Amino acid sequence: MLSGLNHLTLAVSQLAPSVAFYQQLLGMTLHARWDSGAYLSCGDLWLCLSLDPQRRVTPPEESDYTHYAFSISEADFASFAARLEAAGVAVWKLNRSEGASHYFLDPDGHKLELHVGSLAQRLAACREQPYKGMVFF
Amino acid sequence: MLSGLNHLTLAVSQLAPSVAFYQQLLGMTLHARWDSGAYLSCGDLWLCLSLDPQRRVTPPEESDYTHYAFSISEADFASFAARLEAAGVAVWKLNRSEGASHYFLDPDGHKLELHVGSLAQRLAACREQPYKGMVFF
Ligand SMILES: CC(C)c1noc(=O)[nH]1
Ligand SMILES: [Mn+2]
Numbered sequence: 001m002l003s004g005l006n007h008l009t010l011a012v013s014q015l016a017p018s019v020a021f022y023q024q025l026l027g028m029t030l031h032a033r034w035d036s037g038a039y040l041s042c043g044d045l046w047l048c049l050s051l052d053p054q055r056r057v058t059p060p061e062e063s064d065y066t067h068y069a070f071s072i073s074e075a076d077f078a079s080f081a082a083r084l085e086a087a088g089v090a091v092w093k094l095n096r097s098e099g100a101s102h103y104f105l106d107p108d109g110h111k112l113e114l115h116v117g118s119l120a121q122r123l124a125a126c127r128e129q130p131y132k133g134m135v136f137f
Numbered sequence: 138m139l140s141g142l143n144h145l146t147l148a149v150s151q152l153a154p155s156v157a158f159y160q161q162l163l164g165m166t167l168h169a170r171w172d173s174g175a176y177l178s179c180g181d182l183w184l185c186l187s188l189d190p191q192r193r194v195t196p197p198e199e200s201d202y203t204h205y206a207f208s209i210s211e212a213d214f215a216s217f218a219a220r221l222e223a224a225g226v227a228v229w230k231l232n233r234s235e236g237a238s239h240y241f242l243d244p245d246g247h248k249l250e251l252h253v254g255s256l257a258q259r260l261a262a263c264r265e266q267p268y269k270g271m272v273f274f
């Protein structure tokens with residue numbers, strides 16, 4: 001049986017800007033780097049950056065909705081988003097829902113999100129105002 | 138301060154075959170489904186499947202190395218991988234070895250992996266046989 005997410009690997013076009021983004025701007029811990037990759041952690045998350053000649057810097061209009069959301073407390077949310085805005089990090093979507101989300105891009109166009117709240121909270125909100133066709137199990 | 142992964146959202150071209158893959162084949166827990174998405178969990182992982190007509194199915198040879206690995210125990214690894222092969226799940230290939238892993242594709246061409254071992258175990262293995270240019274912090 002599967003027990004959780006083991007690691008998330010992102011393909012990157014250039015290692016140095018990606019390490020700077022994840023380690024210095026986002027504050028993740030850098031454990032190791034080599035000529036074609038790096039290992040970082042963010043809480044329990046193991047993140048691998050893999051240098052890939054096939055990776056293109058992809059505008060948000062040209063990629064689908066696949067995205068990766070990081071946990072943050074409500075108290076820290078606004079100052080963290082403001083840090084990203086000062087650094088010139090692009091936003092790919094406005095939050096149109098209740099609850100706190102900030103949608104931002106990494107240097108290669110991977111779609112990222114800051115989100116406050118758990119699955120249990122989302123399910124409780126949906127039980128009150130379900131999406132079209134929603135069934136619970 | 139970021140504290141880990143909040144959720145993983147995958148864009149899918151057809152909801153029902155994707156839900157069946159993650160729930161029936163991979164054994165993830167289905168919490169809710171609606172006309173354009175589903176919420177599942179795998180241990181601590183919150184997985185969202187989102188119906189996206191912009192999702193294309195690309196051969197693994199022409200998509201980049203971005204991929205998502207799930208944890209499995211040493212005792213369950215070989216029999217789970219054998220079950221995926223017997224179900225006809227397609228494989229893909231990574232450029233380097235990262236330990237005990239099985240690489241497979243989901244119905245929309247997302248690159249998945251079964252992996253045995255933690256980041257700490259990977260770092261210890263790399264100390265004994267490092268990648269080219271490796272530095273440990
Ligand atoms: C599709 C939408 C309701 C959604 N829920 O979590 C996401 O990441 N997107
Ligand atoms: Mn999201």
Ligand SMILES: [Mn+2]
Binds near residue numbers: 009204206235250
């Ligand atoms: Mn991997």
